[PDB]
Design an enzyme around this catalytic site. Structure first.
Site, mmCIF file in Angstrom:
data_model
loop_
_atom_site.group_PDB
_atom_site.id
_atom_site.type_symbol
_atom_site.label_atom_id
_atom_site.label_comp_id
_atom_site.label_asym_id
_atom_site.label_seq_id
_atom_site.Cartn_x
_atom_site.Cartn_y
_atom_site.Cartn_z
ATOM 1 N N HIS A 73 -9.109 2.408 0.330
ATOM 2 C CA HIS A 73 -8.574 3.580 1.030
ATOM 3 C C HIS A 73 -7.767 3.257 2.284
ATOM 4 C CE1 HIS A 73 -8.736 7.694 -0.422
ATOM 5 N NE2 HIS A 73 -9.425 7.142 -1.429
ATOM 6 N N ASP A 116 -14.722 13.042 6.429
ATOM 7 C CA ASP A 116 -14.257 14.286 5.788
ATOM 8 C C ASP A 116 -14.192 14.186 4.266
ATOM 9 O OD1 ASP A 116 -13.793 15.540 8.285
ATOM 10 O OD2 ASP A 116 -11.676 14.986 8.342
ATOM 11 N N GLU A 154 -14.466 20.988 13.999
ATOM 12 C CA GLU A 154 -13.157 20.344 13.863
ATOM 13 C C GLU A 154 -12.096 21.376 14.263
ATOM 14 O OE1 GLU A 154 -13.951 16.729 10.587
ATOM 15 O OE2 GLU A 154 -12.068 17.873 10.447
HETATM 16 C C1 LIG Z 1 -7.960 7.391 1.908
HETATM 17 C C2 LIG Z 1 -8.799 8.249 2.832
HETATM 18 C C3 LIG Z 1 -9.393 7.562 3.908
HETATM 19 C C4 LIG Z 1 -10.142 8.232 4.926
HETATM 20 C C5 LIG Z 1 -10.343 9.630 4.758
HETATM 21 C C6 LIG Z 1 -9.729 10.344 3.674
HETATM 22 C C7 LIG Z 1 -8.954 9.649 2.688
HETATM 23 C C8 LIG Z 1 -8.355 10.452 1.576
HETATM 24 N N1 LIG Z 1 -11.131 10.427 5.666
HETATM 25 C C9 LIG Z 1 -11.743 9.776 6.690
HETATM 26 C C10 LIG Z 1 -12.584 10.531 7.724
HETATM 27 O O1 LIG Z 1 -12.701 11.688 7.690
HETATM 28 N N2 LIG Z 1 -13.173 9.753 8.708
HETATM 29 C C11 LIG Z 1 -13.080 8.433 8.800
HETATM 30 O O2 LIG Z 1 -13.646 7.821 9.669
HETATM 31 N N3 LIG Z 1 -12.229 7.722 7.931
HETATM 32 C C12 LIG Z 1 -11.604 8.297 6.933
HETATM 33 N N4 LIG Z 1 -10.758 7.546 6.039
HETATM 34 C C13 LIG Z 1 -10.578 6.161 6.292
HETATM 35 C C14 LIG Z 1 -11.650 5.209 5.757
HETATM 36 O O3 LIG Z 1 -12.743 5.088 6.697
HETATM 37 C C15 LIG Z 1 -10.935 3.819 5.610
HETATM 38 O O4 LIG Z 1 -9.927 3.839 4.568
HETATM 39 C C16 LIG Z 1 -11.909 2.640 5.386
HETATM 40 O O5 LIG Z 1 -11.220 1.429 5.188
HETATM 41 C C17 LIG Z 1 -12.970 2.802 4.327
HETATM 42 O O6 LIG Z 1 -12.359 2.810 3.053
HETATM 43 P P1 LIG Z 1 -12.879 1.720 1.917
HETATM 44 O O7 LIG Z 1 -14.378 2.034 1.666
HETATM 45 O O8 LIG Z 1 -12.095 2.239 0.719
HETATM 46 O O9 LIG Z 1 -12.661 0.257 2.469
HETATM 47 P P2 LIG Z 1 -11.378 -0.708 2.267
HETATM 48 O O10 LIG Z 1 -10.112 0.127 2.573
HETATM 49 O O11 LIG Z 1 -11.430 -1.245 0.837
HETATM 50 O O12 LIG Z 1 -11.548 -1.817 3.343
HETATM 51 C C18 LIG Z 1 -11.509 -1.550 4.765
HETATM 52 C C19 LIG Z 1 -11.670 -2.870 5.507
HETATM 53 O O13 LIG Z 1 -13.115 -3.130 5.580
HETATM 54 C C20 LIG Z 1 -13.508 -4.337 4.870
HETATM 55 N N5 LIG Z 1 -14.713 -4.018 4.092
HETATM 56 C C21 LIG Z 1 -14.819 -3.152 3.057
HETATM 57 N N6 LIG Z 1 -16.051 -3.080 2.590
HETATM 58 C C22 LIG Z 1 -16.774 -3.955 3.365
HETATM 59 C C23 LIG Z 1 -18.180 -4.339 3.355
HETATM 60 N N7 LIG Z 1 -19.076 -3.875 2.423
HETATM 61 N N8 LIG Z 1 -18.588 -5.233 4.281
HETATM 62 C C24 LIG Z 1 -17.688 -5.716 5.175
HETATM 63 N N9 LIG Z 1 -16.318 -5.425 5.286
HETATM 64 C C25 LIG Z 1 -15.959 -4.543 4.324
HETATM 65 C C26 LIG Z 1 -12.267 -4.700 3.984
HETATM 66 O O14 LIG Z 1 -12.206 -6.102 3.902
HETATM 67 C C27 LIG Z 1 -11.058 -4.115 4.842
HETATM 68 O O15 LIG Z 1 -10.752 -4.982 5.935
HETATM 69 C C1 LIG Z 2 -9.649 10.605 10.231
HETATM 70 C C2 LIG Z 2 -9.159 11.018 8.841
HETATM 71 C C3 LIG Z 2 -8.300 10.095 8.047
HETATM 72 C C4 LIG Z 2 -9.478 12.203 8.224
HETATM 73 C C5 LIG Z 2 -9.011 12.490 6.952
HETATM 74 N N1 LIG Z 2 -9.592 13.647 6.288
HETATM 75 C C6 LIG Z 2 -8.875 14.252 5.338
HETATM 76 N N2 LIG Z 2 -8.069 13.586 4.492
HETATM 77 C C7 LIG Z 2 -7.349 14.209 3.591
HETATM 78 N N3 LIG Z 2 -7.395 15.486 3.477
HETATM 79 C C8 LIG Z 2 -8.151 16.233 4.281
HETATM 80 C C9 LIG Z 2 -8.917 15.616 5.240
HETATM 81 N N4 LIG Z 2 -9.595 16.540 5.903
HETATM 82 C C10 LIG Z 2 -9.261 17.675 5.403
HETATM 83 N N5 LIG Z 2 -8.393 17.520 4.396
HETATM 84 C C11 LIG Z 2 -7.802 18.629 3.604
HETATM 85 O O1 LIG Z 2 -7.110 19.336 4.637
HETATM 86 C C12 LIG Z 2 -7.269 20.751 4.489
HETATM 87 C C13 LIG Z 2 -8.206 21.155 5.582
HETATM 88 O O2 LIG Z 2 -7.568 22.139 6.296
HETATM 89 C C14 LIG Z 2 -7.940 20.971 3.142
HETATM 90 O O3 LIG Z 2 -6.977 20.981 2.079
HETATM 91 C C15 LIG Z 2 -8.779 19.709 3.135
HETATM 92 O O4 LIG Z 2 -9.199 19.446 1.857
#
Ligand SMILES: *Cc1cc2c(cc1C)nc1c(=O)[nH]c(=O)nc-1n2C[C@H](O)[C@H](O)[C@H](O)COP(=O)(O)OP(=O)(O)OC[C@H]1O[C@@H](n2cnc3c(N)ncnc32)[C@H](O)[C@@H]1O
Ligand SMILES: CC(C)=CCNc1ncnc2c1ncn2[C@@H]1O[C@H](CO)[C@@H](O)[C@H]1O
Ligand SMILES: *[C@@H]1O[C@H](CO)[C@@H](O)[C@H](O)[C@H]1NC(C)=O
Ligand SMILES: *[C@@H]1O[C@H](CO)[C@@H](O)[C@H](O)[C@H]1NC(C)=O
Ligand SMILES: *[C@@H]1O[C@H](CO)[C@@H](O)[C@H](O)[C@H]1NC(C)=O
EC number: 1.5.99.12
Length: 498
Positions: free
Chosen positions: A73, A137, A252
């Protein structure tokens, strides 16, 4: 020459070099950057991870960088290992036995595999009538992934981020050693890993704090045309009371630019067409270029009187607020339905082919004293006259609930805002325009002397990472890199030591 355990992985078909394996581990959610690894590891157990890491530390002149792909992600290649090894973490939860998620006998915590997704942690917790207290989220992210960043949502003001709700972890360091860590045992590693951006080792297990699971959430949206009233109310709702917090479970907020107001309000999935018309009319009456909405919940159980008690508690809370008279909008859903609300957006966007598109997202933490300046320069400034695709999220956080000894970087002020501008690109001309607009927003902040911290971003210059952590906190980060990843092979996509 390969060690026996490392060679065994290739022999068992776990260490793949094929086109299909390398291509899947070369792209991420950002859909902006790409880097093919030399190999992809599909571990069946934590022993397979010990093998790769111990080989890397023992083998002199080892040239392969290692990344841990959770769900990919990441926005800017943070989960890639260019010409190295990508660990497909999800493979740890392939075998149905033993379970990778276990709620404690006392019901006070949940043990989860680092590779496990938050949605699965929620289903396994709810089965035992409990649930984690602090979320993201979107639930289709990994435990280890969110924990390497911070993990923020509307609950973080009162429980702190996900990094503040971990009792202990199992971490395989860059040396290849399986180390259990907490505030009492191996605290230096425990603090380094949390918000540590995968630089010190891989999280194989995290012990997550839980609370008794609420059955329902009364879900409200409050509308404002005045930023001063909107921000004052978010702060009132999240203020510590004379440690202790107010009745709200989640807080939020949203920013709506006048140009696409009707479309963006309809796309919330919250407002009816009658609600949209009323808000659009309100904007015109006030001659507003921006509209703001507080999004709040009040969690409650299946009790017979609970619904009537919620109506009175909510009425009391709302009476302390300054939203436009009559612009309170309520919904009432099951707790899991509220928590998984964003999954619905993914499904609809992917079907339209608008999910697997570039995401030049801008995420930052802005000190409370400068939020009004950010609103003027960005919401009422830079963003005006542009066609915005995606939500604009703004909400306050309490610094008291963050542990500054942990790796995650935050502003110095007691109150700071999470600012998430979730832009989706519509064309290549739109991608370049969006990337330049983000540079312009950051330049505006630097010139105004706004002491922000980025979140979910990777810096390309050493001076930027030093400013991100702070010089003293940077010294500790380096001290810890030397102790846990001296060969500097882990998560190279962060561009800190690679
Ligand atoms: C795509 C996305 C991301 C997202 C989100 C909504 C969407 C649609 N909403 C979030 C939210 O509301 N609040 C929040 O704090 N973050 C939010 N995100 C971002 C998300 O936290 C990041 O994308 C994050 O990287 C977690 O995603 P993922 O689980 O898919 O991890 P990765 O992208 O593959 O890697 C991230 C980095 O961390 C290292 N890694 C991954 N897993 C591990 C473990 N088990 N141990 C140690 N390190 C780890 C990877 O190497 C990379 O550097
Ligand atoms: C810190 C980070 C990366 C946060 C990311 N979170 C979100 N990522 C993508 N879509 C979202 C998020 N929060 C709400 N929505 C959509 O936004 C609208 C909320 O008003 C809805 O369509 C809801 O589903
Ligand atoms: C972005 O996604 C598209 C569609 O799935 C794909 O053609 C392209 O290779 C991706 N680009 C990057 C840089 O990941
Ligand atoms: C809001 O947008 C509409 C076009 O969608 C326009 O007619 C109106 O003048 C705008 N209002 C303000 C206050 O900028
Ligand atoms: C309405 O707002 C716009 C943009 O902020 C401005 O050009 C104009 O002065 C305003 N009109 C009135 C009557 O206040």
């Amino acid at each position: 020459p390969w060690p026996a355990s490392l060679a065994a992985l290739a022999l068992d078909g776990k260490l793949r070099t094929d086109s299909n394996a390398t291509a899947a581990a070369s792209t991420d959610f950002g859909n902006i950057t790409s880097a093919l690894p030399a190999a992809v590891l599909y571990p069946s157990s934590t022993a397979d991870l010990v093998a790769l890491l111990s080989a890397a530390n023992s083998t002199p002149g080892w040239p392969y960088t290692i990344a841990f792909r959770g769900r990919g992600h990441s926005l800017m290649g943070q989960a890639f290992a260019p010409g190295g090894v990508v660990v497909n973490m999800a493979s740890l939860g392939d075998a149905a036995a033993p379970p990778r998620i276990n709620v404690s006998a006392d019901g006070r915590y949940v043990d989860a595999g680092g590779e496990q997704v938050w949605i699965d942690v929620l289903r396994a917790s709810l089965a035992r009538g409990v649930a984690p207290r602090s979320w993201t989220d979107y639930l289709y992210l990994t435990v280890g992934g969110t924990l390497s960043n911070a993990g923020i949502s509307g609950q973080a003001f009162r429980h702190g981020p996900q990094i503040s709700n971990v009792l202990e972890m199992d971490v395989i360091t860059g040396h290849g050693e399986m180390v259990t860590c907490s505030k009492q045992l191996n605290a230096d590693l425990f603090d380094a890993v949390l918000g540590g951006l995968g630089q010190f080792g891989v999280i194989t297990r995290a012990r997550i704090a839980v609370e008794p699971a609420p059955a329902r959430a009364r879900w409200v949206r409050l509308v404002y045309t005045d930023f001063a009233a909107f921000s004052a109310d978010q702060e009132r709702l999240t203020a510590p009371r004379p440690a202790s917090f107010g009745p709200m479970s989640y807080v939020e907020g949203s920013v709506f630019v006048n140009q696409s107001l009707a479309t963006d309000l309809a796309n919330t999935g919250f407002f009816t067409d009658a609600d949209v018309a009323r808000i659009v009319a309100l904007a015109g009456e006030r001659n507003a270029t921006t509209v703001y909405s507080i999004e709040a919940t009040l969690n409650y159980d299946n009790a017979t009187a609970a619904a009537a008690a919620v109506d009175q508690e909510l009425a009391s809370v709302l009476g302390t607020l300054s939203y436009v008279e009559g612009f309170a909008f309520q919904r009432d859903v099951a707790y899991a339905a509220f928590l998984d609300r964003v999954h619905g957006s993914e499904v609809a966007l992917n079907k339209l082919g608008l999910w697997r598109v570039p995401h030049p997202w801008l995420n930052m933490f802005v000190p409370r004293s400068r939020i009004a300046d950010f609103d003027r320069g960005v919401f009422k400034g830079i963003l005006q006259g542009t066609d915005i695709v995606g939500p604009l999220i703004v909400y306050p956080l309490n610094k008291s609930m963050w542990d500054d000894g942990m790796s995650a970087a935050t502003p110095s002020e007691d109150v700071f805002y999470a600012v998430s501008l979730l832009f989706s690109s519509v064309a290549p001309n739109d991608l370049a325009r969006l990337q330049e607009q983000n540079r312009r927003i950051l330049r505006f902040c630097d010139l105004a002397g706004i002491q922000y911290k980025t979140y979910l971003a990777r810096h390309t210059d050493r001076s930027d990472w030093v400013r991100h952590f702070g010089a003293a906190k940077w010294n500790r980060f380096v001290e810890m890199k030397n102790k846990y990843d001296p060969k500097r092979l882990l998560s190279p996509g962060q561009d800190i030591f690679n």
